[model samples]
Target: SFPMAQLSTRAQYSRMQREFVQLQRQENPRNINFTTSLKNRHKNRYLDILANEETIYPPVGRYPYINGNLIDLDLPHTFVACQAPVPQGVPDFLETLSEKKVDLVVMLTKLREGGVLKAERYWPEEEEDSLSFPESGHDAIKVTRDSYEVDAELDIVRRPLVIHVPGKPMHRVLQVQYVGWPDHGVPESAASFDELLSVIKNCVTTSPILVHCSAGIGRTGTLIGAYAALLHIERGILTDSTVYSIVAAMKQKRFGMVQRLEQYAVIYMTVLGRLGVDISGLVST
Candidate 1:
């Protein structure tokens, strides 16, 4: 577990709000080209793949690493928020999942949005039983979708994966792809998103939960922020001022988390709604 601060929940909430406002007031360079050595800069930008020094994987190239961050929330290295994989970065993506022993993957975006090639077809198509990543190394990394089901209530498709590496035992992974969320926008209702987080909390028993969208920060940060808020609510901790704090903590770990003010507003609304609070005039115009 990561070392948590000793401040009271009230103090923590206040501090988080202050920091969030400060962060918003500051200038954002939006420099996606921070790391130059990665294979594809266009696909992996906005966040460093190897931001968490202690837990980062070994440098694959002269560059820093992939666009992934090891964010500590309730536990140390609880979440690995990463960008969607491109064709060239697929090997590194598989390696990260295999090395991290991650079982739960939460994809927050569709492959193509508005005719723009936002992300690659990293996983196999629906019909294909398995896909192989020869670029991974001498040991071919193979992924097989053992089963799949679409849950209309949660607006998610649950797929269980069986990963087979050349010389290693088979690994089981579960992927929850959210189908309702649009890029750079919040869902129409928070119920499905809330349920998604609930299921994830219950499933992330061993390895860190892997989360990603196109750039791995906007919707990813929103979901992670909501998760923290849920944790506070579950413990009967004060959370009126927690949304900003949660998002601010995430930005400390990775850049450009919760990109838009509307996204941040969604976090507050979602958390408050989950707590059974009516937020009629909570968000500002």
Candidate 2:
């Protein structure tokens, strides 16, 4: 069944949260496949976190929520799970934004990390900058690259961008880059993630939101997984579908989502905080 089927008390819910996360690793082992159609498009070839060919965007669809043996449940909101775009893949990235009609983008990693280039900056650094995609146009003529202008400011760098493609409707996209994200492990507080979730809630008008990090798993998965869990919690579906189920469903479409134990526990801890519970006593991993 879908989430919020039944309710449980806060007291026992505390212990059950541990059980829920403990089962996440054992229950949802990611199905890893290295058969990516275009390998260089990936920033990390050896990471093994390939986007599942089954649900990779540009096939342009929403993330499915699998419930029980019966169906692949999906929410109304559209979520495009993807890796950080490399220089070569910028055209494809631009195409996805227009073709998929993405409203907001959630980026969780920096352009460089671990002494390596984690992701190329997809948005122009200044108003004078424009990304042109010659391959993204239907005109068939070369130099068909488009002009892009995105607005940036606010905490965490709230960037709202626009793409002007020839013979096509103008596309407006808001991309929020999590600037305060730490180099190691999850964010220092659940509140940081909650702020991101709040931003998504307020900014996305309609259409799917594209989310990415380095490999589009670890921190990326944390944001998406936490978002879904909070939805279920708000709808009061705590008993049946904990964070375990939310992530179990996600990994079916993408490998290594919510990639670590600490990340997994952070979701539940976030939920508890919103429910007015003090999580100071709880151990996070």
Candidate 3:
């Protein structure tokens, strides 16, 4: 009745403009951090967009950069593979490696963040127990030189690691194994965080671990904080390990790191759970 259509149009436009400004804030924080600065610069270069390229993933292409999931790394074969590349307008995720040309693929989060193991797309279930990932991006390779197919272990340990092709070879993978869920904190078989940790410790090689949860700062940070504190106490770095100190350090390294602080409180509960400490009363309290 009172120019309702015109008012709606104006509202939509205003909303769109506000979203644009908010996006800018998310990318370009008040003070440019070193990590953020590099992430943005990488986006503008090296990543190519091919309209006709076909990848095994029907939605995306074969090239790692197709969806910007592959991140550049400074060290040889070392890079962070996340759900996706750092958003546009932000600096490259890690600027130091801009020149190294190493790439890290952010495959499925099931293996890392969710702690749910996963196999490659269309991988044969018969080979689920098999450990093999070739650089050609398949279990088997075609040897045109000899006209044969070869099955081999590409990496050193026959485990999952970044695989590189000519012009780009993965150096290393900072494998992140996120743990800590309230109701089902640890897997049924793993039973407890300590047991789960032991399993992880055995599997870890010399590669650096990048454990994290949703925020990369909450439950992920809590477990990491506690572990660090305990190690410090053992190493004589501190008279007594305190979760607060470790958490503070994490925050300093990455501001606003803890997405959900409540998750930290669950650590004590998880500890009790691991010890089989009958804490029905404490859990309620």
Candidate with the greatest lDDT versus the true structure: 1
Candidate 2 lDDT over residue span 116-230, tens digit each: 7777776656554455645465742111223332323322666667766556677777777875554336875555677788876566456777787777777877788777777
Model 2 residue 10 lDDT?
47
- Top candidate by TM-score: 1
Better of 1 and 3 by TM-score: 1
**Candidates' C-alpha lDDT:** 0.68, 0.60, 0.31
Give the Å shift of residue 50 in candidate 3. 28
Error of 1 at 188 (Å): 2.9
User: lDDT for model 1, on a 0 to 1 scale?
Assistant: 0.68
Could you tell me the TM-score of candidate 3? 0.41
In model 1, the runs with Cα more than 4 Å from the true position are: 1-21, 25-65, 75-77, 134-139, 280-285
Model 2's lDDT to the true fold?
0.60
TM-score per model over all chains: 0.79, 0.74, 0.41
Assess the local accuracy of residue 180 in candidate 2 as a C-alpha lDDT between 0 and 100: 52
